[PDB]
Design a binder for this molecule. Structure first.
Ligand SMILES: Cc1cc2nc3c(=O)[nH]c(=O)nc-3n(C[C@H](O)[C@H](O)[C@H](O)COP(=O)(O)OP(=O)(O)OC[C@H]3O[C@@H](n4cnc5c(N)ncnc54)[C@H](O)[C@@H]3O)c2cc1C
Ligand SMILES: NC(=O)c1ccc[n+]([C@@H]2O[C@H](COP(=O)([O-])OP(=O)(O)OC[C@H]3O[C@@H](n4cnc5c(N)ncnc54)[C@H](OP(=O)(O)O)[C@@H]3O)[C@@H](O)[C@H]2O)c1
Ligand code: HEM
Ligand SMILES: Cc1cc2nc3c(=O)[nH]c(=O)nc-3n(C[C@H](O)[C@H](O)[C@H](O)COP(=O)(O)O)c2cc1C
Lengths: 602, 214
């Protein structure tokens, strides 16, 4: 086709978006993205790259306020897509100078492959190498979690940053319309249920994400023996739900921000929380009609529907800039949308790091008198929290037990913050809880004879309690129980050693073969479950290799899980003697076979 | 290798590559199916799963298969029925076709469940695991091709209610197979049967390709 530089100035645009699409996902992203520009300041066009003459790239800065964007999918072992071939090889063997050219890239990928967004990474790197300048972070979409979610996140924060570098700024364009139903009948207003109206009152199965069951809290005891943190065991009765579960399974939970916290926002925002209302999605052919169950109050929303705790995203701060009367105040808000410079430096420091929630922002920015309805547009939905079930359905058919740490801490915000679910959970005294049961493939093996290694430092001991219960049960049934190992860990023996007595009972009952306990602050050198493993290596090896033992790692993911993995690698490497790298292969094979299974979080 | 799961992949490595490069599959992978084309295959599959799941039900308690019984997490019959209702309307019942390839496959299934239970697992390995690997991409190509609702109607067979992570589930499934007690003679039989099952699928794909472009 006739050159794209010409066709931009001819069709009246500044922004251009190229898509490398195989199955049309990249295209989908590209098209939505250039259509965002149109009502966000500028005006974009999405194009198939194979039909335009790509030498014309350093000819882009001839269009004033120009930016170029790339949406490319990673295929195979990190290789390119169809319509992207001409470009790719040119890029590989060019180095003619791109100084002054503005760009940004989004990668479409999957974490189960070891070439994660290799395509996207390449393109993003290469352009910089030629003299060109990046405006926004390279996106790393992931199909293992949810690629779409990763995209939407990235997109949410792109536009605000783009605006700030260039100036532009309609910086305000709405997506919902407020419709007060000021005089309206009572039982057609949502009170915080998740699915249908009065779903929380009319409880019949199916019970799930959209019709939670409300389980009655049978008890709550502080397992925490010290004072450092509060760690708690709760018992949720699911008697007539006829929900089934298996040990190691999750139970998901629908919490409510502490109403006290709620109220402050309402106050300082200065509206009536109890105002019955709806926000209607005005983009008519969007069947996503309200951001949350409507009709309902602001009270009901802030308490049950919206996420008022996890700090703001960049975009919402940019949105809010407009309600600040103070110029200086406005400026700060405007800055924290920049994807780089000082602007990015600040935001990470004073928002995300300091864990300034919505409320804190308002408190720290007096000018912010934004409308409550518009805020109830800009807030993320309250995500449910899930908990590894700490019971066995064979000993507790009618009860789902949870183990958890309650969250609470001095941030750099000066503000003491609270955990939503955990604080909420804590207040539930022996009071109903909306929850469902989601399946995991964290499971005990079929052969009761199969030995088990359980590694569960901290609350990670949770699902493993269920495991232990099940093993105990087996022995009551006269079935042959294999070797059963718990490698647990905590800070100090008298402080936070979860289920001390019951675990010990299990020890002496024969049900738990070895109770190994890593006490980490009982000396000035730290003692971890890896250490314990190292100590026992030979015993472990015979179990894994002769007994055909299963491996379970539950708990902290950042450090612990992969330290444990490394320890296992070393065990393999020395005992059916291998190259380190051979050992890793063996380990990996184990996982595939389904003999090494995890269940972590942060 | 030693473990059933490891063995089967190696034994069907060849067959898989040929199944996936048959004309129907390759075309499908670039997004080239007709509504009739899609309609046919689903119909055929319905019969297969009805037979398979009947046999499973029969032998859910025999230890040559009991460790591979996943009614909650896998069973496809109800889901397939939904898709038949969507694709062939309220009359789907005897409206759906019943190709020769399909028939042969089903009758083999009957035999296997009838006198060779120990081998069921080969069929199961071929089927369910496939659905959790290729299946997810295949579902999503359907939207581009037939542009169906992200309300999900017509793609119940490709949607897995109970299974939160297909990668995770494959994990467990493989372990489950290993838990079956079998002599390596019987292991070899099972491996052979896996190949047979693959062949059965492959024959279907090429049949239906004839009848489309036609
Ligand atoms: C599959 C899965 C299974 C899980 N199982 C369990 C389980 O069995 N038991 C269990 O306790 N948890 C479990 N979790 C984690 C759990 O769901 C929650 O993350 C946790 O319980 C806190 O929820 P909350 O709403 O109470 O706290 P939130 O209100 O969500 O706030 C907690 C968040 O604030 C931040 N934070 C906390 N302390 C600090 C600090 N000092 N400085 C800065 N930031 C901080 C972190 O982002 C933290 O995740 C699991 C998670 C997953 C994904
Ligand atoms: O949070 P929570 O419920 O998990 O409890 P937690 O108290 O944060 O940690 C649980 C246990 O694991 C230890 N730990 C910390 N980092 C670790 C790592 N990389 N590997 C192994 N153990 C580690 C802790 O010791 P320390 O907290 O004393 O490091 C403690 O003994
Ligand atoms: C659309 C083309 C297909 C592609 C690209 C494809 C690709 C793959 C891949 C990459 C795996 C490995 C999964 C993993 O990484 O864990 C796999 C597994 C599998 N596939 Fe396919 N597949 C296709 C179609 C089919 C077909 C037609 C069948 C048979 C009906 C099938 C049956 C299986 C089975 C049974 C497994 C499990 C193998 C194992 O245990 O590792 N697939 N496929
Ligand atoms: C056969 C195949 C192989 C893939 N390999 C990788 C990979 O190695 N690394 C990665 O990050 N993503 C990988 N992906 C993820 C794709 O990029 C992802 O599915 C993307 O959404 C497809 O985009 P498209 O529909 O626009 O082509 C792979 C996808 C497929 C279908």
């Amino acid at each position: 086709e006739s050159s794209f530089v010409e066709k931009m100035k001819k069709t009246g645009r500044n922004i251009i978006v190229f898509y490398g699409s195989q199955t049309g996902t990249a295209e989908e992203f590209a098209n939505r993205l250039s259509k965002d520009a149109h009502r966000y300041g500028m005006r974009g066009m999405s194009a198939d790259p194979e039909e335009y003459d790509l030498a014309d790239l350093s000819s882009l800065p001839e269009i004033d306020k120009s930016l170029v964007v790339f949406c490319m999918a990673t295929y195979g072992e990190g290789d390119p897509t169809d319509n992207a071939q001409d470009f790719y090889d040119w890029l590989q063997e060019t180095d003619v100078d791109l100084t002054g050219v503005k760009f940004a890239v989004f990668g479409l990928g999957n974490k189960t492959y070891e070439h994660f967004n290799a395509m996207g990474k390449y393109v993003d790197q290469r352009l910089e190498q030629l003299g060109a300048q990046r405006i926004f972070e390279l996106g790393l979409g992931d199909d293992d979690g949810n690629l779409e979610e990763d995209f939407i996140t990235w997109r949410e924060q792109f536009w605000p940053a783009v605006c700030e570098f260039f100036g532009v700024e309609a910086s305000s364009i709405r997506q919902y319309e407020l419709v007060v139903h000021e005089d309206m009948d009572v039982a057609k207003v949502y009170t915080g249920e998740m699915g249908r109206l009065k779903s929380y009152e009319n409880q019949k199965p199916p019970f799930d994400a959209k019709n939670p069951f409300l389980a009655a809290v049978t008890a709550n005891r502080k397992l925490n023996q010290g004072t450092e943190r509060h760690l708690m065991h709760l018992e949720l009765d699911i008697s007539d739900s006829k929900i089934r579960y298996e040990s190691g399974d999750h139970v998901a939970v629908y919490p409510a921000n502490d109403s006290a916290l709620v109220n402050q926002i309402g106050e300082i925002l200065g509206a009536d929380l109890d105002v019955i209302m709806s926000l209607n999605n005005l983009d008519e052919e969007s069947n996503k009609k309200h951001p949350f169950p409507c009709p309902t109050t602001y009270r009901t929303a802030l308490t049950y529907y919206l996420d008022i705790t996890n700090p703001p995203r960049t975009n919402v701060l940019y949105e809010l800039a407009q309600y600040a009367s103070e110029p200086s105040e406005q400026e700060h808000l405007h800055k924290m949308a920049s994807s780089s410079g000082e602007g990015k430096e600040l935001y990470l420091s004073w928002v995300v790091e300091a864990r300034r929630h919505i409320l804190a922002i308002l408190q720290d920015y007096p000018s912010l008198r934004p409308p409550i309805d518009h805020l109830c547009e800009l807030l993320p939905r309250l995500q449910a929290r899930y908990y590894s079930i700490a019971s066995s359905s064979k000993v507790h058919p009618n009860s789902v037990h949870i183990c958890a740490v309650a969250v609470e801490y001095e941030a750099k915000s000066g503000r003491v913050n609270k955990g939503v679910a955990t604080s909420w959970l804590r207040a539930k005294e022996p009071a109903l809880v909306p929850m469902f049961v989601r399946k995991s493939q964290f499971r005990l093996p079929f052969k009761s004879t199969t030995p088990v290694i359980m590694v569960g430092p901290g609350t990670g001991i949770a699902p493993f309690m269920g495991f232990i219960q099940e093993r105990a049960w087996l022995r009551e049934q006269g079935k042959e129980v294999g070797e059963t190992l718990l490698y647990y860990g905590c800070r100090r023996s008298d402080e936070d050693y979860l289920y001390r007595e019951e675990l010990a009972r299990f020890h002496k009952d024969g049900a738990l073969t070895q109770l190994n306990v890593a006490f980490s602050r009982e000396q000035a050198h730290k003692v971890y479950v890896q250490h314990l493993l190292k100590r026992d290596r030979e015993h472990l090896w015979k179990l894994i290799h002769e007994g055909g033992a299963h491996i379970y790692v539950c708990g902290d993911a950042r450090n612990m899980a992969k330290d444990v993995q490394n320890t296992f690698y070393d065990i393999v490497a020395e005992f059916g003697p291998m190259e380190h790298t051979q050992a890793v292969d063996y380990v990996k094979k184990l996982m595939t076979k389904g003999r090494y299974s995890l269940d972590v979080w942060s | 290798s030693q473990d059933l799961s490891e063995a089967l992949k190696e034994a069907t490595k060849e067959v898989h590559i040929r199944a996936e490069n048959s004309e129907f599959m390759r075309n499908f992978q670039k997004g080239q199916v007709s509504r009739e084309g899609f309609k046919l295959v689903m119909a055929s599959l319905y019969h297969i799963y009805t037979a398979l799941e009947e046999e499973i039900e029969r032998n859910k308690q025999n230890p040559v298969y009991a460790p591979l019984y996943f009614p909650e997490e896998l069973h496809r019959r109800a889901a397939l029925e939904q898709d038949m209702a969507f694709w062939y309307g309220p009359h789907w019942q005897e409206a759906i076709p019943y190709t020769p390839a399909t028939q042969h496959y089903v009758k083999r299934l009957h035999e296997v469940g009838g006198t060779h239970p120990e081998l069921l697992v080969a069929h199961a390995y071929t089927r369910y695991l496939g659905d959790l690997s290729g299946g997810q991409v295949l579902k999503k190509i359907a939207q581009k091709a037939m542009a169906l609702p992200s309300s999900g109607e017509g793609l119940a067979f490709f949607t897995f209610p109970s299974i939160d992570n297909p990668t995770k589930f494959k994990q467990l499934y493989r372990a489950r197979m290993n838990t079956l007690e079998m002599t390596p003679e019987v292991k070899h039989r099972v491996t052979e049967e896996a190949k047979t099952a693959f062949l059965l699928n492959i024959e279907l794909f090429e049949e239906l390709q004839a009848l489309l472009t036609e």
